[PDB]
Amino acid sequence: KTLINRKKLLEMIPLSTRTIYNLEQRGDFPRRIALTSRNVAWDLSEVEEWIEARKSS
């Protein structure tokens, strides 16, 4: 339903861009979506699900 940008993602998750990228490459963070070859975004629902999964470990 909703795609969020880097700024909103970093406002939600207190992590740096580097750590989030490394987590994505490890398969441990929702993969960014290339809206274009210049624009990226994250599915809000997947970010929330990742937060809950971290809360449940």
- Burial profile 2-25: b = 16 or more Cβ within 10 angstroms, e = fewer: eeeeeeebeeebeeeeeebeeeee
The boundaries of the domain holding residue 38 are 3-56
CA-to-CA dists, residue 45 to 1, 4, 50, angstroms = 8, 10, 9
Structural domain tally of the chain?
1
Resolution stated for this PDB structure, in Å: 2.1
CA-to-CA dists, residue 17 to 1, 5, 42, 56, 57, angstroms = 24, 12, 13, 24, 23
Q: CA 41, CA 22: separation in Å to the nearest integer?
A: 16
Q: CA 9, CA 31: separation in Å to the nearest integer?
A: 12
Structure tokens at 16: 């740096």
Q: CA 40, CA 29: separation in Å to the nearest integer?
A: 15
Q: What DSSP string runs through 10-40?
A: HHHS---HHHHHHHHHTT-SPPPEESSSS-E
Method: X-ray
